[PDB]
Ligand binder design. Structure first.
Ligand code: HEM
Ligand code: HEM
Ligand SMILES: N#Cc1ccc(CCNCc2ccc3ccc(N)nc3c2)cc1
Ligand SMILES: N#Cc1ccc(CCNCc2ccc3ccc(N)nc3c2)cc1
Ligand SMILES: C[C@H](O)[C@H](O)[C@H]1CNc2nc(N)[nH]c(=O)c2N1
Ligand SMILES: C[C@H](O)[C@H](O)[C@H]1CNc2nc(N)[nH]c(=O)c2N1
Ligand SMILES: [Zn+2]
Lengths: 406, 404
């Protein structure tokens, strides 16, 4: 009937339609000929900018119920005149707040979006040095960590400016363990971070040799080389991993940090580009227990734990991988709880995201969602989102990926 | 144009150029991706074009392209469509087509096996009774006392203005789902509609959780007929856990033969509306989906209580623990009963190998990531970390409306 994507939940039998997708301005990677949905990273003119700026201003006035108003039309003339003279324009404070929240809300790969309204936005568009970026970041970490009672936050630094260098945080997260390529070809620490480790070295960091060494920050102010800042340890809250009944698990000496703070994503709002705008939430347990600790190309501790558990690792059909993986996820949850550090398991998360989808069905007529990223990397069909069809598309405001500064 | 496909565990990159041979639209557009939808939303030069292409494929497959036999076959097909609006396949072509359809199936994790498929031509079938006989033979062959073998039986093609040969059942072996009026369901809830159709067509129902249904076979433009499968034809495996002696007491069992019977087989424009095929199970299908899915037998909590776990909360991963033991139970049981089965680790490991064979052979391989990654332990398998391109090649298995 409706000229919109019919969406089905196969557990409950319920149908919805997505009308929100009709608001999408940007093409994704798919075509009638092939679906490229499983690719991680698939491949201004004042006219262009203005149309984006206008669209965002309309989104904004809509959210405060003043679409059509004198303040709405005036704001548009203001933005247009601003672009007409400077090539760019600037956002008001509450516009930046609404956009930051809307970029999160629009993020198709994020299962934590039920929280999208509770996002603390720190304005740091006054920042003029790399030392200043460090203070803001430290403040963010302090506020967001909150002694283990975690709080979603983002800190926004100056936007891209015509003929001027970006503000860039070089690291992909604010907190990252070092990756040390060994002489025997192997890697000590986190293999994910070999390149950022070597970059920190080339820039004069005296490197450690642990499995869990916190990297310094490489902060870059416009038209200047990156400077190096070492985070004070007490600011970086960590959780030692023990298991609730496997007494030896604590002896493995594994740990993870409390705060997931992504720092290399571009925040786009109304055609304005914020190249440095780190944000943080809290972890879902499988991020640590499954991806970071058990990916072959990460810590890859699955065999280790499996041996300690005395499993038959010579054969797939023992499900020793599945067994070990559970106990690692359980230990992540148990330790974070014990340490009173905010964390959510993948059942509780996906349940909360089903409620999110229902909220947005009413609120906006749909929700852009990446099924491959929303389903957890363990126990997939045991969570309710596995049985939920999803429609994926790009809305703006948006968190976008951006090429590495070097 | 050509997609860059990356494996994120190994850093390896391929380029799918096989996709450029796709003549059929998928659900996606540049504006929104609809990859997660389970089903699709909804002259004679057309048929002749698909007909030539397939013939072209066939004669290339046997390295005999441009030959006299190739040229003659094209004229035969062309002459037959011109005169009758349709044509027929030679058995050898059919064998080829059916294999290519399996090979092209983007959702199938078991395609390493594609070239090894026993094809039964049943296009000379003319009644429900004959359909039944062909089905019994397929089951006997394919089951092979537990050493499962992959077979397809192909019934007569659809014809303009005539009913289709159909098997109403989705699989040749389904368990009855009896709707107890108190909301609940006894048996497999996935099979409520089909179980009702059977009773209204005169089947005497049971009152059990694992009651094998009869088949409803329909010869064209006739009411479907009811056929009970001889109990000895339906091989089944009682489930017991290797260390939890209390598991067998749950009275759990599953059948050995996964035979899908409601998909349409399309080869060279011709359509085969009844072409049940079968292989062997991947353990997670039974252990995770069929037994643990909420809208199926839904045994997770039950098992979890007998393991004395904390149902009170999610953070205890009781669901994940119970599921792992259920999957273990299934693998153990089947291996103990000497019935063919593949775990999700072995299966995805062979699929990787398959993608590689395919990359060398055709320059790509259509794969549905959401369907290739198993329902548990996703990232613990190599296919999770592999990018995939999805598209529609022909010959192809398709979905089709239920014939009622
Ligand atoms: C509040 C608790 C949160 C939870 C539990 C959560 C959970 C997750 C998880 C598990 C992922 C998958 C990422 C991966 O596997 O690499 C994700 C993705 C994402 N999250 Fe959230 N998130 C939270 C908060 C936030 C916040 C505050 C923001 C920004 C304002 C945000 C923005 C995003 C974006 C843009 C992605 C896409 C990842 C990418 O494309 O690289 N999330 N989230
Ligand atoms: C030999 C062992 C085989 C294994 C282990 C296997 C495995 C699987 C699995 C696990 C699925 C996912 C199904 C689901 O979860 O609903 C699937 C799908 C599929 N398989 Fe295979 N398969 C095998 C043989 C075959 C054969 C012989 C054929 C046909 C000739 C075939 C054709 C298909 C098709 C068309 C799908 C798509 C399912 C759908 O969308 O309904 N497979 N396979
Ligand atoms: N190249 C590359 C490449 C590598 C990893 C990713 C995924 C990184 N996502 C990390 C991420 C981002 C935001 C998050 C928000 C909350 C949370 N708990 N985890 C979060 C995790 C994408 C591209
Ligand atoms: N409507 C609907 C609808 C519901 C479920 C499915 C999935 C059916 N696929 C089952 C299936 C198909 C082929 C298989 C081949 C081998 C195997 N071991 N299992 C197999 C299982 C499709 C459409
Ligand atoms: C190849 C595949 O697209 C890739 O590994 C994806 C799959 N799903 C994911 N899902 C989440 N949440 N995070 C990820 O990094 C990925 N990676
Ligand atoms: C909506 C979602 O795509 C749907 O549940 C899919 C996901 N992946 C699947 N994968 C397999 N193998 N079988 C399935 O039925 C499904 N279901
Ligand atoms: Zn797509």
């Amino acid at each position: 009937g409706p000229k919109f994507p019919r969406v089905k939940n196969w557990e409950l039998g319920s149908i919805t339609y997505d009308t929100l997708c009709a608001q999408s301005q940007q093409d994704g990677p798919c075509t009638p000929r092939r679906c490229l949905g499983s690719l991680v990273l698939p491949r201004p003119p004042a006219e262009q900018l203005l149309s984006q700026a206008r669209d965002f201003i309309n989104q904004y006035y809509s959210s405060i119920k003043r679409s059509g108003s004198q303040a709405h039309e005036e704001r548009l003339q203001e933005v247009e005149a601003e672009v007409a003279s400077t090539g760019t324009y600037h956002l008001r404070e509450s516009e930046l707040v609404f956009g930051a929240k809307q970029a999160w809300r629009n993020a198709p790969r994020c299962v934590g979006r039920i929280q999208w309204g509770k996002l603390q936005v720190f304005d740091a568009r006054d920042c003029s040095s790399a030392q200043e970026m460090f203070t803001y970041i430290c403040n963010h970490i302090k506020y967001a960590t909150n002694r283990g009672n975690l709080r979603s936050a983002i800190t926004v630094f100056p936007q891209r400016a015509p003929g001027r260098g970006d503000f860039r945080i070089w690291n992909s997260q604010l907190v990252r363990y070092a990756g040390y390529r060994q002489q025997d070809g192997s890697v000590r620490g986190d293999p994910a971070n070999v390149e950022i480790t070597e970059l920190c070295i080339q820039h004069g960091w005296t490197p450690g040799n642990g499995r869990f060494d916190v990297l310094p920050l490489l902060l870059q102010a416009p038209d200047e080389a990156p400077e190096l800042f070492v985070l004070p340890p007490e600011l970086v809250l960590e959780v030692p991993l023990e298991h609730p009944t496997l007494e030896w698990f604590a002896a493995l000496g594994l740990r993870w940090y409390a705060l997931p703070a992504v720092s290399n994503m571009l925040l786009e709002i109304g055609g304005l580009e914020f190249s440095a705008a780190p944000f943080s939430g809290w972890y879902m347990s499988t991020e640590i227990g499954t991806r970071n600790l058990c990916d072959p190309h990460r810590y890859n501790i699955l065999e280790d734990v499996a041996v300690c558990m005395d499993l038959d690792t010579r054969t797939t059909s023992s499900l020793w991988k599945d067994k070990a993986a559970v106990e690692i996820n359980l230990a992540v949850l148990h330790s974070f709880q014990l340490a009173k550090v905010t964390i959510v398991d993948h059942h509780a998360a996906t349940v909360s995201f089903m409620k999110h989808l229902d909220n947005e069905q009413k609120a906006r007529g749909g929700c852009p969602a990446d099924w491959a990223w929303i389903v957890p990397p363990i126990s997939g069909s045991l969570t309710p989102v596995f049985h939920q069809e999803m429609v994926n598309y790009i809305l703006s405001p948006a968190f976008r990926y951006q090429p590495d500064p070097w």
